[PDB]
Amino acid sequence: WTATSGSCKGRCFELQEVGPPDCRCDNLCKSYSSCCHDFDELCLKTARGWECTKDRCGEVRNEENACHCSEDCLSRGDCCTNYQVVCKGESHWVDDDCEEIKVPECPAGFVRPPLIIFSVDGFRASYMKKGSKVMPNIEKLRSCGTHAPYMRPVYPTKTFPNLYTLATGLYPESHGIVGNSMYDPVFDASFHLRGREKFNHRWWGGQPLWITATKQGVRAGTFFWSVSIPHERRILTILQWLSLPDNERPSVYAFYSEQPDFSGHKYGPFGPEMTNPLREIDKTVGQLMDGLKQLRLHRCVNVIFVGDHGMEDVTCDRTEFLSNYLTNVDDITLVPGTLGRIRAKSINNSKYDPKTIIAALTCKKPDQHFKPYMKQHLPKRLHYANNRRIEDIHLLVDRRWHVARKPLDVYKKCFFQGDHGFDNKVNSMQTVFVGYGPTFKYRTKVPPFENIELYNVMCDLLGLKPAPNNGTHGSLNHLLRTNTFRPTMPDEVSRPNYPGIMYLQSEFDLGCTCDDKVENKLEELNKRLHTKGSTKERHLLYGRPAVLYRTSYDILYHTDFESGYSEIFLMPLWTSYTISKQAEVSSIPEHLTNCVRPDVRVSPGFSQNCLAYKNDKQMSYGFLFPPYLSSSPEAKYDAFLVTNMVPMYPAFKRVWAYFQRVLVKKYASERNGVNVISGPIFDYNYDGLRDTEDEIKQYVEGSSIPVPTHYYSIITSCLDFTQPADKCDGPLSVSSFILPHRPDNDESCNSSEDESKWVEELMKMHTARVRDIEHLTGLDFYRKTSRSYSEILTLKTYLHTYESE
Ligand SMILES: *[C@@H]1O[C@H](CO)[C@@H](O[C@@H]2O[C@H](CO)[C@@H](O[C@@H]3O[C@H](CO[C@H]4O[C@H](CO)[C@@H](O)[C@H](O[C@H]5O[C@H](CO)[C@@H](O)[C@H](O)[C@@H]5O[C@H]5O[C@H](CO)[C@@H](O)[C@H](O)[C@@H]5O)[C@@H]4O)[C@@H](O)[C@H](O[C@H]4O[C@H](CO)[C@@H](O)[C@H](O)[C@@H]4O[C@H]4O[C@H](CO)[C@@H](O)[C@H](O)[C@@H]4O)[C@@H]3O)[C@H](O)[C@H]2NC(C)=O)[C@H](O)[C@H]1NC(C)=O
Ligand SMILES: Cc1cc(OCc2cc(C(=O)N3CC[C@]4(CCOC4)C3)[nH]n2)c(C(C)(C)C)cc1C#N
Ligand SMILES: [Ca+2]
Ligand SMILES: [Ca+2]
Ligand SMILES: [Cl-]
Ligand SMILES: [Cl-]
Ligand SMILES: [K+]
Ligand code: NA
Ligand SMILES: [Zn+2]
Secondary structure, eight states: OOOTTSOOTTOTTOSSOOOTTSOBOSTTHHHHTOBOTTHHHHHSOOBTOSOOOGGGTTOOOOTTBSSBOSTTHHHHTOBOTTHHHHHHOOOOGGGSOOOOOOSOOOOTTOOSOOEEEEEEETOBTTHHHHTGGGOHHHHHHHHHSEEOSOEEOOSSOOHHHHHHHHHHOOOHHHHSOOSSSEEETTTTEEEOSSSSGGGSGGGOOSOOHHHHHHHTTOOBOOSOOOTTSOHHHHHHHHHHHTTSOTTTOOSEEEEEEEEEHHHHHHHOTTOGGGHHHHHHHHHHHHHHHHHHHHTTOTTTOEEEEEESOOOEEOOTTSEEEGGGTOSOGGGEEEEOBSEEEEEESOTTOSSOOHHHHHHHTSSOSTTOSEEEEEGGGSOGGGOOOSSTTSOSEEEEEOTTOEEESSTHHHHOOOOOSEEOOSOTTSGGGOBOEEEESSSBOSSEEOOOEEGGGHHHHHHHHTTOOOOSOSSOTTTTGGGBSSOOOOOOOOOOOBOOBOOOSOOOGGGOOOOOOOOOOOOOHHHHHHHHHHHTTTTHHHHOTTOOOEEOSOOOEEEEEOSSOEEEEETTTTEEEEEEEEEOTTOOOOOOOGGGTTOOBOOTTSOGGGSOOHHHHHHOSSOEEEESSOGGGOSSHHHHHHHTBGGGEEEEOHHHHHHHHHIIIIIHHHHHHHHTSEEEEEEEEOOTTOSSSOOOGGGOOOBSTTSSOBOOSEEEEEEEEESSTTSOGGGOOSOEEEEEEEEEOOSSOTTOTTTTSOGGGTHHHHHHHTEEOHHHHHHHHTEEOOOSOSSOHHHHHHHHHOOOOOOOO
16 A cells, blocks of 8 residues: 655655655656656656757746756756757767767766666667667767677576676576566566566565665666656656765666667567667667766766667567477476476476476477477576576577467467577677776777676776676776776685606506507606606696685696596596697507506596496496597507596597597697697586585496586687697687586487587587686686786687677
């Protein structure tokens, strides 16, 4: 109950709330059905529209008007945004030349440049080029400020997950807004776009920017605007708040437009009907900038123009129906559309089997436009699993398609020509970023980056300490003229041991054999130097990775590779090697096919054993440094050390062997050498973070050898590919992957074919950032380069997406 007969007299768009049953006048009252009786009359004035005309200039104030053209309006802070232009011979901001904003130029009493976040729904990245002729204000912000060619959203590429990621710096799995529809089984409660449960604060985790600011003494304008409040009124409200006295005035503001998304759903991303919504957004930007210029704030405020996601062509006829795959289709609940999430209709029904649902959805039709996954098997780059609100069964839907349960759901519910929500690597889902202001750089293009990074930057713009988040603070310092965050490398927690030769061959009873008794003083001193690290400059190009947790490990040097070997996990944490453009691929000779050799530097008790692998009928083994790339027949023996062995399912060995035999060499040829760091990952609880040993759910049968959930590789070369990877003077180029360690290749529908037809496609799907690997391993890479640490942070956040232009 709200007794709505109090008044909004003087309280219109009040910043601080008042608690029911007092009536409210803030821009959320509409949504609660709790506005005071006179809210529309007082707060939503519309009389005479939004623009001054010549006949209104110097009028007598009439408090009924939507905005004012009277002499006193500037000091009241409520002029129409074009007042100075119509009535005082001023230019619109868009007609003025770009002039570098070297320092903030602010009215007295401003303690810091305000931040205005101008968010646009569905604003696909290519609109910046394709709509350029009709968006002059946006194009000025873009060319004069700092911009990226695009900004990557989070998955799913829906509105609330992305807006709340913008506000928190968190992945959806962590902030808890995991889709536009949700069931939380702890609360036994559902979240929907329509209605009122979506306003309960227990849905929304982490710490959004307005809370961060408020806790640290910085005042915030509202971020949420009710749909009924017209755009012109949102802009006027921001401009009025900017005229408040110093102790009352917010420092951070947001605007939101439901366009161009609204129209894109109806007409597709490039429907002829889309020109008009783009024009109208630009006009709104023009209103804001003219308004700021009138208030002498246009060289004081930092403006961010940012989208939540793009928009793809999607029609009703491109719908896959689960009724064409499953016969039990009424025993499930599907969250449908551009992604799929499946759970049991009833938790009382113990007949429901996820394995058989997954199998009935796997590679069943020749051009099947969705792929089923257990959530823990989704590409780690999506970071879409560690939340009880994410159902175990997930369907990744091809761009341009939908999934639905039954045909009845599509025509008893064609309407739409656009949608979004797909994999965040998809070109059509990419969105925009421009930063314009004293704190941003002038006329500067920056590379594409992920929206999870912006929270830290907005905190930097406001002098705030960010709450813990998934950004990598410092990776976006290159956007900024000043306020840069000066990060430092994390301290190494565990130092390595450097073991020498300590064990005789006969102390090992590993059940391994090798055909290797083949007896020189030139080449005796030679091999000793290699085992003491003589080639380490060649194979370890960026320093050893730092171990950021407490553990016991050994550095092991070899002619062709260096490794950090874990005494706890009985395998390397990391293995590092460099393959030049000129390197030759060789075969594993017949006599060495099953060769495994004890490592006389590492005790029997801290070694793997061959008998376990023999006994484990499901599990085989591979090698981290590939025997195929040995520098010489004699060096090849090092590759068969028991300390280079890792557990691998035979199905996975098909993937790994093709990577190592064909792909590494291809990359070295294409990139002019590569440095490779490879290793295991253990993420049995799918939290994106390195497992402790007591979290491991699977071991090689009858042993303490833990089974990885994934294998990674980080492949680094010179960005200037005229220089070889091992003699690079300037910036680096990286691609990485985190491959799931699976006992079948069910994910790859073409896997019965030769590896040249499906392996590289799988590796692309599981593309990763170095930072993703860092989280999953507790390692810190690139510790010793000639590059600035901020540049290295940017490198560590890079994702190679394998989409065309
Ligand atoms: C991306 O960035 C984020 C942010 O930095 C990273 O997430 C953090 O990761 C930490 C490790 O996983 C995690 O720390 C744990 O927090 C527990 C207390 O947490 C509460 O308070 C914080 C702070 O205010 C709050 O933010 C949390 O909010 C979560 O939960 C509510 C729902 O209840 C949601 O509204 C919200 O969205 C958020 O959910 C997300 O995180 C939780 C985990 O907290 C997930 O379950 C959800 O799925 C969702 O993703 C909390 O309200 C604290 O109790 C933990 O301590 C245990 O573990 C330590 C090990 O050091 C042990 O020593 C302790 O004693 C304790 O163990 C005991 O409890 C165990 C669990 O019951 C029990 O099994 C044991 O036997 C012991 O008795 C722990 O410190 C931190 O909370 C989150 N923060 C957020 C915001 O998610 C994320 O990792 C980054 N991602 C990547 C890929 O890098
Ligand atoms: C900049 C910013 C804005 C923002 O919200 C702006 C907003 C969204 C809506 C709204 O009405 N929506 C959204 C979904 C929809 C549209 C079509 O139909 C469903 C209704 N209104 N205002 C938020 C949140 C976290 C408050 C959402 C965070 C940030 C940040 N950082
Ligand atoms: Ca949206
Ligand atoms: Ca984990
Ligand atoms: Cl959803
Ligand atoms: Cl708000
Ligand atoms: K085996
Ligand atoms: Na297959
Ligand atoms: Zn939409």
